[PDB]
Amino acid sequence: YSNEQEQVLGQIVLANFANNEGLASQGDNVWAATQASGVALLGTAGSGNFGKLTNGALEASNVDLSKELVNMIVAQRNYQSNAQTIKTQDQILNTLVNL
């Protein structure tokens, strides 16, 4: 304030879950707690089992582009292999029908 005095308006609460993999993503970089993830355990930053908060900073995504590209290549090759299997079954069925 302007009177050389400050006030506290609130304290941001943090949530921790037993099962992180159980949280169902609802989009808009937002998660919703469900039965598999359990009930949310609430607390404050830096106390208990919570990490502290960094001010003036944002956490970026953990997506590495190189690994994604290589996995895309491998998955494309696997998809084409499965398509080859489908073609094999197609030729087998065609051979039997042409009998």
Binding site: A18, N19, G22, Q35, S37, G38, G48
Partner: protein, 202 residues
Amino acid sequence: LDENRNLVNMQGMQLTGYPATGTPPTIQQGANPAPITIPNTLMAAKSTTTASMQINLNSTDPVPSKTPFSVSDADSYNKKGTVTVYDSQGNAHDMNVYFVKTKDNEWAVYTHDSSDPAATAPTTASTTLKFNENGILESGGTVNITTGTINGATAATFSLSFLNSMQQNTGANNIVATNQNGYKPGDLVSYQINNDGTVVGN
């Protein structure tokens, strides 16, 4: 890690293993495998039952000048050390151990609890460490020590040890090792699986 704190695979089948029983918990391999679970159950405190203080002593130390002993006066003793023990509720008791050289190779050690404000200052020898011809501890390496009663918690009595302590021409008296088997309550911070299959919660 599912909602019930069990280790399960993607399809939900529970991983099995040898469970841990007893205090301190150890893997008992004589039992049948059971599903592995990781509870958040706070860990309770353990009052101390065994403490150890390995220290090296200087031979050239002169005897204290200002007889009698006072825990207040620094010149009244040769050395002072601090060991933190824990009672039934996990409260910290800071045992101060005081070394006064009495005769050649003879060191009286006093024990005083500084965490209890109403505890009286010791006036009589708690133990007399005896060192042989060359450091080699001779007798008096183990003493029963009783804590004070703080905030209604049960006082923890324990065996305090001076084994493998030596007294030679070392430059000064400094503590080498202090250990104790007690701990204060703690909450689950992390969990890990070792390469030997043990699941360990920190």
